[PDB]
Amino acid sequence: TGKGKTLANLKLLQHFGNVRCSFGLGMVSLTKQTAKQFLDMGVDYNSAAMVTGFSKSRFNLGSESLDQDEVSVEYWGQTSSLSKVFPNNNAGFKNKKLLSAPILVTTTDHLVKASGVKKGNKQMLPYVRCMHSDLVLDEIDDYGIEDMVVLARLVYLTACYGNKVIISSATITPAISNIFYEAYSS
Amino acid sequence: TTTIKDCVAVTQELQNWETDLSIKILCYHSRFVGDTKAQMEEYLSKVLNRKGDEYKKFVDTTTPTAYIVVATPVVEVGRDFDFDWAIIEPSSERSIVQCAGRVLRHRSSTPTTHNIHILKYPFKFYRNSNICYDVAGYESKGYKLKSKNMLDIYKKESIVNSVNRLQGDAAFYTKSLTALEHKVLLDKLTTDIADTNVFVGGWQLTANPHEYCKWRRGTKNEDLVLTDGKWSGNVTTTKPIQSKIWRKWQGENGSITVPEYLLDKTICYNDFYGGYEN
Amino acid sequence: MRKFIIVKNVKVDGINAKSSDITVGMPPATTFCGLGETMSIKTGIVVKAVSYGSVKFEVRGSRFNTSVTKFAWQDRGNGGKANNNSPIQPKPLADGVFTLCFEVEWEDCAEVLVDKVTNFINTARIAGGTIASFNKPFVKVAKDAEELASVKNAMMPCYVVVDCGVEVNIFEDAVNRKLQPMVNGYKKLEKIVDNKHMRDKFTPAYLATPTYTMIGYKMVSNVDNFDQALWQYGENTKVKTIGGIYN
Amino acid sequence: FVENSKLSKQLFDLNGQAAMHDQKIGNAIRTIDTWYEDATTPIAVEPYGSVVRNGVAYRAGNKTDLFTLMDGAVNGKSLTEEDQMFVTANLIRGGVFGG
RNA sequence: CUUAAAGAGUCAACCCUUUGCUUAUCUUCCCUAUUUAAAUGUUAGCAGCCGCAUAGGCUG
DNA sequence: AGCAATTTAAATAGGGAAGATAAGCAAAGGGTTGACGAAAGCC
DNA sequence: GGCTTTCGTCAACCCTTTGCTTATCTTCCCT
Structure with a gap:
C-alpha cells in the first residue's frame, strides 16, 4: 500500500493500447478514492464513470467552489452501440453509465451479477459489460469467501472473452492467487 | 476489536478507567447514522494523515494526550489511517497484517521496542470457548483451533508483515492462526466444481451457484431509520458516558443497519457509540 | 466429497x-456397523461408516441389576417341565432413542435414497430391538470440512461415540481414566469345523x-x-473410527 | 430502618399518621443510668452502658457491666445501691443474659 | 442380516404418636428543582321564512 | 385533527445478638426362573 | 439302537446405592 497500485493498474492497461476496463472495488469510499486519483492525474469523465448504486447523501460542506474534490456522477462519456439491443434503450442514467463506460470505476456488485442471477434480466448488463471490457479487482482479500468465489467466477467469465484480469492484492495467499489463475486459465 | 458490543465494552471500560493518562476515546464501528458516520470518516482521514504536519491543527497536540480510536474491522479495510500504535483483538491473521498497515502507514521511522500489542484472547472466549475466532475470521465449525491461546497459535514476538500470509502453510492448522487461514482458503476456493465452488460447470445452467453461493451473504439486516431526530423502530436514544469522548458528531437523518437478531431488543442508538445490547 | 443420510430420533425398544x-x-x-452392512445387503446402498448417537437410553432394571427376561419354553424335548417357569439365561433388555x-x-435423487433407507428401517432391528418410531431420514452432504460439520451438527441432539483407545487393559483404565468400555470388534480363537x-x-465361521x-x-x-x-469396519476383524483415537 | 426503598428518610407512619416507635419511647424511659464511671449525663439502661451515637459503651472493660454485677450479686458480693439499682433496671428493661 | 434369532414378573399392604422459640432492641442526621412559553389549525357550521318536502332558494 | 421540550443530579456510615434443644419404638417376607447324569419304559 | 420321559445329583455370596456429558447464535460489505 502507498505505492500507487491503481495507477499502476491503469498503466498496465494502457501499455497494451487504449484502456477499456472495469475497476471493481469494494466499498463506496474506495471507489471514490480511485475516482479522485483518476480525476486529478489524467482521466476526465468522457472516459471514466464512477458508479455507486445507492445515491448516498454524503455532501461536501464548507465551500462548494473551493472544493477541488468530491468526484460526482455525470458521465458525459460516449453511448455505446450496445444500448440499442438492451430493453427500452438500456435505461436512464445508471445503466448508460454501466454499459457505455470505457473505464468503469464501480462498486463490485455491479459486476458480480454477470455470472448469473436468480430472477430477472439483471445478468445481461454486467455480462455484456464484462464481455468487451477488462476486469481490475483491487484488494480481493477483504471480500468474503463466497464473495471471492463469485469474484473468481467473474474472472473466469471475463477471461472467457479474452479480456485481461488485473488482481491487485499485497497480502495474497497462494491459494487465492492460484484459484484466480485457474479461473483465468479456464 | 471484533464486533460492535465488544467495541462499546472496550470504550465503556476505558472511559471509566482511572489513570493519569489523558485518554480521549473515539468509537469507530459501522453501526452509525448517515450523518454521524460520514463525519467520523472525514475527521479521521484528516487527523491520521501523517505525510505532513497538517494534523497538528485538527487535534490538541500541545497537551500530552492519548488519542484512542476503538474500532471494529471497518478500520482495517480501505482506510488510509496512520496510528502511532495499535492494540488488536485477534480474529484472523489478515486482520493483524491490515492493522499493522494502519500503523506507520505514512511515516518511515522504525519502532524501537514494540508498536503492536496483540491481546491474549478474543473476547468471544468468555462467551463461547468452543469457537471464538469465527466473527471476522476464518475459524468456523468445520475448522476449529485445538487451542485458543495466542501463545500457542501465534508467535509471542513477531514482525508482522504480509510474509505469513504470502507463504502458505496447510500443516498444523489446528494450532496456528496462519495455517488455519490458509487451510480454509484452499478448502473453499478449490479447483473443483462442487456447487458453491469456483470451476462451476454444469451448474451454471442451474440456479444453484446464485442461491447457495450468495454474494455479500449477510444476516437478515433490517434498517432502523432516524428521521429528523426521531427514530423509527425500537431504538431509544441514550446518553453516553461523557468521560473521555474527544469528538462526538451529532446526527439527525440517516439510517442504522440492525441485524434481525438484535431487532428483538432495543438497539439503543447513541450519539457517541451506535448500537449495543443494554 | 462425502454424502450422508441421517435418521433422527430412532426410538427403539427391546434392545439386547x-x-x-x-x-x-x-x-x-x-x-x-452390522446394521450398516445389513442395508448394504438389503437395499444395495453400500455403506462405509455409521455415526450413531444416543438421544435417550435406559437399561431395563435397577441401578445395579438389569431386569431379566421371563424365558419361554421353546426348546424341543423338555415338555413336562413346561408347566414350571423356564430357566433364565442372562439377556438384559433396554430401550433407546x-x-x-x-x-x-x-x-440417484435423494428421494429414492430416503425411501430405500426408510424401507430398510421399517424392516430393520437395532440391536435386537424393534424400531418403535423414527423421523423421516434426510440427506446431507459433506463437500468440505465445514460441510462435514454441518452434517455433524444435524444429528443434534445425540451423544455420539468417540474412541479413546486402550492403554493397558479395560478394567484398569475404566476406573482410572473413567471412560466407557465397548466392543470394537472380536478376536478369532478357533476355526469352526461344524x-x-x-x-x-x-x-467360514x-x-x-x-x-x-x-x-x-x-x-x-x-x-x-x-x-x-x-x-x-476396519481390516483387523474389528471396527474403528475414521479419525482414529479421540484426543 | 430502610435499605432498598428509593427514598432517603422514611418516618414511622402508623396508618399514615406520623408516630414514633415504642422502643424510642422505652429507651427514653430507661435513660436513668447516671451511675457509671464518667457520669455526667443519664444514659439508657443497657447491659454494657452502650450508646450507638457516641460509639462507646460506658460500662465495658471496667468491671461494671450488668453481667459481672449479676454474677457478683448471685454469688454473694454485696451490690452497692446504685449498682443494685442498675442491675434491677436492666432486669426490668429485659434481655437475654446468658452465655 | 446388528452376542442375529426368542421370551407376561406378577401379587399384597394402617407410619405412627407426642410436642411453649422464647427473650431486649434510638435509624439519623443534611438539603434551592430551578428559567421560559401565541394553542394554532377559518374553531363554527347558526337564528326565520319562502315553501308539500327532512327537494330547492332567500334573509343577516 | 396532531401538537406535550431540553440538561442536571439521586447520600455518604454504622449495626445486622447469642443460648437452648433437634426422641425413643418396630416393621423391612419369600413364592418361580436346573443342566447334565442316570435308570427306564418305548418305538 | 436310539429315544424320550422322569427322577436323582451337586451345590453354597462380601458387598456398592449416580454421573457417564452437560446442545448446532453476526464482524465487514453494498445493494
Missing part, C-alpha cells in the same frame, strides 16, 4: 443390552472373544472432527 459378557448397556459400534448417520455413496448348525454352510476399546460419550456438536465419531 448384553453387548458382551462384561458390557451391558448401549449397543457397541459393531452393532451399528438413537440418531444414526450413514456415510453412503449414491448416484457348519451344520449355522446360518450358512459356506460362510470362527469362535470369537470380543475385543474392547475404551470410548467416551461427547455431544455431536462438541466433537471437533466428525471422522472421530464415524465407525466403520
Whole structure:
C-alpha cells in the first residue's frame, strides 16, 4: 500500500493500447478514492464513470467552489452501440453509465451479477459489460469467501472473452492467487 | 476489536478507567447514522494523515494526550489511517497484517521496542470457548483451533508483515492462526466444481451457484431509520458516558443497519457509540 | 466429497443390552456397523461408516441389576417341565432413542435414497430391538470440512461415540481414566469345523472373544472432527473410527 | 430502618399518621443510668452502658457491666445501691443474659 | 442380516404418636428543582321564512 | 385533527445478638426362573 | 439302537446405592 497500485493498474492497461476496463472495488469510499486519483492525474469523465448504486447523501460542506474534490456522477462519456439491443434503450442514467463506460470505476456488485442471477434480466448488463471490457479487482482479500468465489467466477467469465484480469492484492495467499489463475486459465 | 458490543465494552471500560493518562476515546464501528458516520470518516482521514504536519491543527497536540480510536474491522479495510500504535483483538491473521498497515502507514521511522500489542484472547472466549475466532475470521465449525491461546497459535514476538500470509502453510492448522487461514482458503476456493465452488460447470445452467453461493451473504439486516431526530423502530436514544469522548458528531437523518437478531431488543442508538445490547 | 443420510430420533425398544459378557448397556459400534452392512445387503446402498448417537437410553432394571427376561419354553424335548417357569439365561433388555448417520455413496435423487433407507428401517432391528418410531431420514452432504460439520451438527441432539483407545487393559483404565468400555470388534480363537448348525454352510465361521476399546460419550456438536465419531469396519476383524483415537 | 426503598428518610407512619416507635419511647424511659464511671449525663439502661451515637459503651472493660454485677450479686458480693439499682433496671428493661 | 434369532414378573399392604422459640432492641442526621412559553389549525357550521318536502332558494 | 421540550443530579456510615434443644419404638417376607447324569419304559 | 420321559445329583455370596456429558447464535460489505 502507498505505492500507487491503481495507477499502476491503469498503466498496465494502457501499455497494451487504449484502456477499456472495469475497476471493481469494494466499498463506496474506495471507489471514490480511485475516482479522485483518476480525476486529478489524467482521466476526465468522457472516459471514466464512477458508479455507486445507492445515491448516498454524503455532501461536501464548507465551500462548494473551493472544493477541488468530491468526484460526482455525470458521465458525459460516449453511448455505446450496445444500448440499442438492451430493453427500452438500456435505461436512464445508471445503466448508460454501466454499459457505455470505457473505464468503469464501480462498486463490485455491479459486476458480480454477470455470472448469473436468480430472477430477472439483471445478468445481461454486467455480462455484456464484462464481455468487451477488462476486469481490475483491487484488494480481493477483504471480500468474503463466497464473495471471492463469485469474484473468481467473474474472472473466469471475463477471461472467457479474452479480456485481461488485473488482481491487485499485497497480502495474497497462494491459494487465492492460484484459484484466480485457474479461473483465468479456464 | 471484533464486533460492535465488544467495541462499546472496550470504550465503556476505558472511559471509566482511572489513570493519569489523558485518554480521549473515539468509537469507530459501522453501526452509525448517515450523518454521524460520514463525519467520523472525514475527521479521521484528516487527523491520521501523517505525510505532513497538517494534523497538528485538527487535534490538541500541545497537551500530552492519548488519542484512542476503538474500532471494529471497518478500520482495517480501505482506510488510509496512520496510528502511532495499535492494540488488536485477534480474529484472523489478515486482520493483524491490515492493522499493522494502519500503523506507520505514512511515516518511515522504525519502532524501537514494540508498536503492536496483540491481546491474549478474543473476547468471544468468555462467551463461547468452543469457537471464538469465527466473527471476522476464518475459524468456523468445520475448522476449529485445538487451542485458543495466542501463545500457542501465534508467535509471542513477531514482525508482522504480509510474509505469513504470502507463504502458505496447510500443516498444523489446528494450532496456528496462519495455517488455519490458509487451510480454509484452499478448502473453499478449490479447483473443483462442487456447487458453491469456483470451476462451476454444469451448474451454471442451474440456479444453484446464485442461491447457495450468495454474494455479500449477510444476516437478515433490517434498517432502523432516524428521521429528523426521531427514530423509527425500537431504538431509544441514550446518553453516553461523557468521560473521555474527544469528538462526538451529532446526527439527525440517516439510517442504522440492525441485524434481525438484535431487532428483538432495543438497539439503543447513541450519539457517541451506535448500537449495543443494554 | 462425502454424502450422508441421517435418521433422527430412532426410538427403539427391546434392545439386547448384553453387548458382551462384561458390557451391558448401549449397543457397541459393531452393532451399528452390522446394521450398516445389513442395508448394504438389503437395499444395495453400500455403506462405509455409521455415526450413531444416543438421544435417550435406559437399561431395563435397577441401578445395579438389569431386569431379566421371563424365558419361554421353546426348546424341543423338555415338555413336562413346561408347566414350571423356564430357566433364565442372562439377556438384559433396554430401550433407546438413537440418531444414526450413514456415510453412503449414491448416484440417484435423494428421494429414492430416503425411501430405500426408510424401507430398510421399517424392516430393520437395532440391536435386537424393534424400531418403535423414527423421523423421516434426510440427506446431507459433506463437500468440505465445514460441510462435514454441518452434517455433524444435524444429528443434534445425540451423544455420539468417540474412541479413546486402550492403554493397558479395560478394567484398569475404566476406573482410572473413567471412560466407557465397548466392543470394537472380536478376536478369532478357533476355526469352526461344524457348519451344520449355522446360518450358512459356506460362510467360514470362527469362535470369537470380543475385543474392547475404551470410548467416551461427547455431544455431536462438541466433537471437533466428525471422522472421530464415524465407525466403520476396519481390516483387523474389528471396527474403528475414521479419525482414529479421540484426543 | 430502610435499605432498598428509593427514598432517603422514611418516618414511622402508623396508618399514615406520623408516630414514633415504642422502643424510642422505652429507651427514653430507661435513660436513668447516671451511675457509671464518667457520669455526667443519664444514659439508657443497657447491659454494657452502650450508646450507638457516641460509639462507646460506658460500662465495658471496667468491671461494671450488668453481667459481672449479676454474677457478683448471685454469688454473694454485696451490690452497692446504685449498682443494685442498675442491675434491677436492666432486669426490668429485659434481655437475654446468658452465655 | 446388528452376542442375529426368542421370551407376561406378577401379587399384597394402617407410619405412627407426642410436642411453649422464647427473650431486649434510638435509624439519623443534611438539603434551592430551578428559567421560559401565541394553542394554532377559518374553531363554527347558526337564528326565520319562502315553501308539500327532512327537494330547492332567500334573509343577516 | 396532531401538537406535550431540553440538561442536571439521586447520600455518604454504622449495626445486622447469642443460648437452648433437634426422641425413643418396630416393621423391612419369600413364592418361580436346573443342566447334565442316570435308570427306564418305548418305538 | 436310539429315544424320550422322569427322577436323582451337586451345590453354597462380601458387598456398592449416580454421573457417564452437560446442545448446532453476526464482524465487514453494498445493494
